Structure 1
């Protein structure tokens, strides 16, 4: 995935989830839209 120090919604189907405090972007449209840490 991507460990950008600033995760953003790259698409419309991206969601921001905060599992384990870590703020992640998970997109069930494009797997290149998977980011790790806010």
Structure 2
């Protein structure tokens, strides 16, 4: 999990999701692409 202030889609499979008021990036392909704004 990358916890950074600027979360972005890193590939085609990255999806932006907002869970409990937290912007997150989930990627079905690359586990390295998992991010969360913080």
The interval holding the TM-score normalised by the smaller chain is: over 0.9
Runs of at least 5 residues in structure 1 that lack an aligned partner in the other structure = none
Structure 1 position 28 matched with structure 2 position 31: no
Q: Shift in Å at residue 4 of structure 1?
A: 1.1
Runs of at least 5 residues in structure 2 that lack an aligned partner in the other structure = none
| Greater strand share, structure number | 2
Runs ≥4 residues deviating over 3 A: none
**1:1-38 residue CA offsets vs partner (Å, 9 max, x unmatched):** 00110000001000000000100000000000000117
Q: Distance in 1 between matches of 2:14 and 2:4?
A: 15
Question: What is the RMSD computed on CA atoms of the aligned residues?
Answer: 1.1
Q: Secondary structure at the match of 1:36?
A: strand
